[PDB]
Amino acid sequence: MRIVAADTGGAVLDESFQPVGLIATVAVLVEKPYKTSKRFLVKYADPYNYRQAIRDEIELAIELAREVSPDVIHLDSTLGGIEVRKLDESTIDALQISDRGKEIWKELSKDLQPLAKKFWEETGIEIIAIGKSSVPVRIAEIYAGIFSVKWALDNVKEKGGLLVGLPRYMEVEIKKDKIIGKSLDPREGGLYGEVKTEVPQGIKWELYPNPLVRRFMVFEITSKS
Amino acid sequence: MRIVAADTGGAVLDESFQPVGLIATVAVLVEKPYKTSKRFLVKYADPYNYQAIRDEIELAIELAREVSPDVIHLDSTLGGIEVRKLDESTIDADRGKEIWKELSKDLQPLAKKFWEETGIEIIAIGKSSVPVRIAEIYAGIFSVKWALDNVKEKGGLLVGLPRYMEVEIKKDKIIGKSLDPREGGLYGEVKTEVPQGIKWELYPNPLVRRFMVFEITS
Amino acid sequence: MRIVAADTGGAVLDESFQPVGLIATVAVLVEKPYKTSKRFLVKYADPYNYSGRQAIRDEIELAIELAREVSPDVIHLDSTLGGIEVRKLDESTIDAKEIWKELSKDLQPLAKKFWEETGIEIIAIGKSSVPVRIAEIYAGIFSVKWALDNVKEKGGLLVGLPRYMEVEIKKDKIIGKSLDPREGGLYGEVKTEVPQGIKWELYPNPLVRRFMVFEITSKS
Ligand SMILES: [Mg+2]
Ligand SMILES: [Mg+2]
Ligand SMILES: [Mg+2]
């Protein structure tokens, strides 16, 4: 099975760990053995001017899918595997979720449903709201963490610093020519990602637990002085 | 403490990872340090034609008549109440209360007799029990053994393992381990014939996070 | 950020893994990089004489005591309530339960007085807090130190550890680590004299998945 998935992750935090805005939306193509992705796209938001996220996700997943022709698209909404092209107010009412959840997806339907309908009509490919059950979604999330770190390394102010809140229980490792992202949960079976980049000089970095949010890590960049 | 527990796990999957039916029910004897089992029984189902709790309680009782444990752990998370005490009244203390109210007809007296016979309680503990989890891991292990023994006649097989466990295939045995270090190093080991001219692989079920797939081909 | 947290943990188990009483209440000071604590306080309870109201009472005073020494930015209390400030804990905001209305009459004045002196909030954050988890691990460690220090001659002792943590015995030390790598490598360290004439082992509580047991047995 060949799967395209998307997710949004990585947040700029202030020095007191308060979220400021999200950084990266990533679409991935995942194939057997379903541990990583070698083909992916990134879209960067502006964290300092921050759901537009799920709109960027479905749009980016569709763009990648048009290139690689997967069997299915996985969307990060935990709905049971229902097709997005079939998401109307009635089918949402039949979903076992919160009333605000239903309210939220009724609003989103207006933008997502027509998009998935048109893509399906063109390809026969379904976009499914599978959410947290999906490994490709988790891999997308992992890549969003890596790309958020890459973004921070590329944009950190001279003599300045930057805190990036990573997606849940993942770590990044810095190499001279790339960033490696890995789930910290061995139960996931070894999910990981790698992205090439140039690591700049004059800065230090540190990965540590977000003291306010258990199982979430922070990647902090500080300037050398 | 010496414990017999039972569970059912391992599933045949189609090529699109959709489950077809369960494979193995396993009863285990577990003693200190409660990380593995050395004495165990297995009962296979017909996955292509798939109540597990009935086979679980029987296979547990069966092993118990051979090793005489202090207690039996049944896979039903009820906080530890004795099964022989499970009658419609005691049950009432929601869809679940309804289903347990059906099972209790055959199970309650079955455990009553056993307790009178042996002085051994059958407690409904489920998710809290380490022995139950050890039984589950072995069910995974035997599901792989089942797969090894059926692949030649089937050509290719996808086995869905129980949650977050891996298997490793060595010279004369299958080793299974929990992937969750929080469980404290739970593992199992089963000696078996490894047929030749096969290739196998372990990888994430892309549709079910934290579940692994054991794939074997000829 | 500098945070003082507290929690109670470590249990005495009987032969059949049944909890008897809790052992240690620990306040910890946690700073960057938020993996451990190098300054901490402990109060031992009497496990054989132990509802759970005393623990959070002992927790808040130990935290305040520690806070007066190290002056943190905030205090974390083990109670998951989204992070409400304890000094603002009365009927109207609690109602937004019957337990806390009993607790508030003691805790709220403590928090109010402390905030008045320092401006430091005591927040009911609970499980979201890393420093609370670090306090919990230290409770596990001090519980082992307690067991080592108090095991009878030719007697034994079962210590029920807090959730998914391990302890390692070293020559002059007890080390505690979380068994969940998702937490990012949280650990603790406590200096102590390890008694002779005793053996130990660490193994899964068979009745409580993901909880470990640390057992002391006397050599013969
Ligand atoms: Mg998402
Ligand atoms: Mg079961
Ligand atoms: Mg507590």
Author numbering:
A (entry chain A): 1 to 50, 55 to 229
B (entry chain C): 1 to 50, 56 to 98, 103 to 227
C (entry chain B): 1 to 50, 53 to 98, 106 to 229
Lines from the paper:
Here, we report the crystal structures of PhoExo I, which shares 76% amino acid sequence identity with PfuExo I. In this study, we determined three substrate-free structures of PhoExo I and four structures of PhoExo I in complexes with ssDNAs. PhoExo I is a novel RNase H superfamily protein.
In this study, we determined three substrate-free PhoExo I structures using three crystals with different unit-cell parameters (crystals 1–3). The protomer structures of the three crystals were nearly identical. Although the protomer structures of each trimer are nearly identical, the trimeric structures are not identical. These data suggest that the trimeric structure of PhoExo I is relatively flexible at its N-terminal half in solution. The Mg2+ ion is coordinated by Asp7, Asp80 and four water molecules in an octahedral manner.
